[PDB]
Ligand SMILES: C[C@@H]1O[C@H](O)[C@@H](O)[C@H](O)[C@@H]1O
Ligand SMILES: C[C@@H]1O[C@H](O)[C@@H](O)[C@H](O)[C@@H]1O
Ligand SMILES: C[C@@H]1O[C@H](O)[C@@H](O)[C@H](O)[C@@H]1O
């Protein structure tokens with residue numbers, strides 16, 4: 179079965195690491211961190227890895243139940259919630275995954291909305307349940323962030339109106355802050371089972387091997403609740419590529435696919451890239467920053483090549 | 493002729509094309525009195541997007557634009573006029589043959605979400621990272637001030653001051669503010685995209701069974717509530733992944749109807765069959781309302797092109 183990529187353009191792609199559209203292609207050759215994100219991880223023959231799942235609505239989402247308000251040194255009102263799988267089934271910590279699929283894969287203060295729909299109903303209210311929603315923050319670097327253990331903590335501005343024991347949804351929206359105390363680092367993984375524990379079942383780190391090459395990312399700018407900043411989240415492949423590869427399950431005929439970024443209006447190749455078996459792109463570029471190209475551009479699979487292939491410089 | 497196909501995503505792997513929600517259940521309601529004419533999640537089987545449908549899951553019920561004015565409510569809350577662009581940031585051209593900017597909500601109600609802003613500019617001499625803010629907001633799509641086809645809408649906030657004019661603004665939808673009587677939630681009533689006395693234009697057509705004994709089959713999602721009582725749902729004709737797939741493939745439609753079977757892969761058994769109509773919606777032979785009780789690892793498989801006169805096996 180022939181390997182293919184979707185023919186979605188850049189303006190028709192979304193980030194696999196946060197629910198955002200792709201804004202630009204981006205490189206950063208001098209990156210010192212190990213790149214080992216856990217969402218947006220899929221091999222070219224369709225094997226999902228890390229915490230990657232298929233739903234755009236599941237990325238950095240949680241489902242579960244609030245148990246109780248809990249004490250925390252930091253500003254706000256804090257709440258513990260058990261978390262299930264996104265489909266509502268109990269999370270089984272013995273599954274070979276780092277954490278429930280969809281769990282955030284970076285250090286930071288994730289801002290979103292917690293909403294609840296009660297299980298019990300009121301006969302006087304048409305046998306309909308009570309609801310509430312409030313803004314919430316999840317500090318993924320907190321020692322109380324333990325999604326692999328089945329529970330996490332979030333904070334609210336709201337001091338009282340979060341109910342215990344009721345079905346709870348977290349809808350991510352952006353970051354609370356990128357100030358010095360907010361520990362935003364997109365390449366630092368959370369400790370999924372808590373402080374001082376080793377993460378397990380990780381999707382592998384990715385890196386260029388060939389001289390002169392660097393990773394190419396699909397970059398999205400992420401909203402902020404407050405403060406100064408222009409934070410971004412870079413994914414290895416957009417969510418639509420995860421979904422496509424998973425569907426197709428095309429055998430990988432070598433370790434490296436040659437892809438061409440094409441202008442469909444003109445037919446011209448803007449640049450070429452290596453698409454590696456584990457699901458990431460490299461290019462021959464010696465600079466950091468956006469790739470300035472039209473958003474109607476798209477990657478086209480050309481052929482299977484190998485580690486010895488020399489890319490034309492961007 | 494390029495063969496027609498559906499994605500092999502299961503129900504637990506599909507999302508709603510009318511609001512950013514996972515699909516929860518398949519659903520019928522034969523006795524529905526409203527005309528079904530939603531504008532998001534509209535795609536022909538040969539890949540033609542219709543209505544306000546676009547491809548991004550992040551674009552559904554999203555807005556992009558700039559705030560122009562603050563207006564305090566008589567009683568409570570603050571209203572903000574917002575001039576909207578296309579989601580890709582280019583100016584919205586109202587003479588474009590669409591009902592409204594792609595992604596515009598397609599139903600009456602109070603849509604609850606978060607408005608966020610990232611300022612364009614920084615203060616000369618004063619540090620070079622832009623200022624940001626986000627607050628909860630509500631968009632009343634039934635409001636006379638909801639005129640996205642004219643290039644502007646209004647949202648309201650609890651926040652009374654901290655929303656900036658002339659700065660890039662994003663609306664991230666989250667759910668509904670209310671489903672009380674005064675909140676006018678009706679998923680099949682279209683907004684008046686240009687205001688109340690003006691006719692909507694360039695609409696995707698209404699959908700309905702033709703053949704006796706059939707009813708529409710929907711992909712149903714439950715939508716969060718900011719407050720109050722209720723368990724509101726949003727029904728789409730096809731999930732967003734089917735829109736994306738059909739658009740990609742652009743397979744010619746070889747009859748008016750693609751016969752599809754909902755299959756249990758564990759047993760290989762067909763649970764039921766359905767008609768997938770050329771204009772992009774499903775019907776089944778069912779004479780009851782409510783969820784279809786089936787495993788979420790079940791999925792629709794294309795069987796063959798049939799005629800509109802084909803008689804469905806009763807569900
Ligand atoms: C819920 C809280 O209300 C306050 O007025 C705001 O200043 C906070 O940002 C937050 O939204
Ligand atoms: C930089 C400042 O951060 C705060 O959270 C906001 O409320 C202000 O509007 C401003 O953007
Ligand atoms: C921003 C507003 O703050 C208040 O405390 C809340 O009661 C409202 O629901 C809203 O969130």
Ligand SMILES: C[C@@H]1O[C@H](O)[C@@H](O)[C@H](O)[C@@H]1O
Nearest residue numbers: 308309310339719720721
């Ligand atoms: C029914 C009530 O509606 C309000 O908005 C909520 O704040 C309460 O928690 C409760 O759900």
